[PDB]
Amino acid sequence: KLKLFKKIGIGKFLHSAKKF
């Protein structure tokens, strides 16, 4: 069990705040 390699790109989460 180990599939969080894509969790290192949390730069798009701050984007959701750039649209709301």
Side-chain angles (χ1 to χ4, degrees):
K1 287 163 230 66
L2 220 147
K3 70 205 196 101
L4 68 133
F5 258 139
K6 166 149 279 221
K7 250 123 103 192
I8 309 183
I10 310 137
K12 282 251 267 214
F13 231 99
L14 238 95
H15 211 214
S16 150
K18 251 258 96 271
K19 166 61 137 96
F20 241 146

